[PDB]
């Protein structure tokens, strides 16, 4: 749905996130066209040195079907993952928005 995208390359994600209308925290979860079940989280944020940037985080998979960006905290699915980082940055560069 709105935050989930299939087959979107790293650079397409970059163009989409950097478009006017997007703010810090704007983000999207993308699935690799080649390796099904392989997800990445792309976020818009501000770098003091760089300026507006798009960061990329690798979502890893558990053997039980679940996910995590940091072993510290795991989730049963992509929704729960979004609900958490949406509420706390918890390790990320900034909380997600929308």
């Amino acid at each position: 749905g709105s935050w989930f995208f299939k087959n979107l390359s790293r650079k397409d994600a970059e163009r989409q996130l950097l478009a006017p209308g997007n703010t810090h925290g704007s983000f999207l979860i993308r699935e690799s066209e080649s390796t099904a079940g392989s997800f990445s989280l792309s976020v818009r944020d501000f770098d003091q040195n760089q300026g507006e940037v798009v960061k990329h985080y690798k979502i890893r998979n558990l053997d039980n079907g679940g996910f995590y960006i940091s072993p510290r905290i795991t989730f049963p699915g992509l929704h729960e993952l979004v609900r958490h980082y949406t509420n706390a940055s918890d390790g990320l560069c900034t909380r997600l928005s929308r």
Binding site: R10, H56, I69, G91
Partner: peptide, 8 residues
């Protein structure tokens, strides 16, 4: 490697 952000 791709080059993903390091997290703690």
């Amino acid at each position: 490697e791709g080059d993903f952000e390091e997290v703690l």
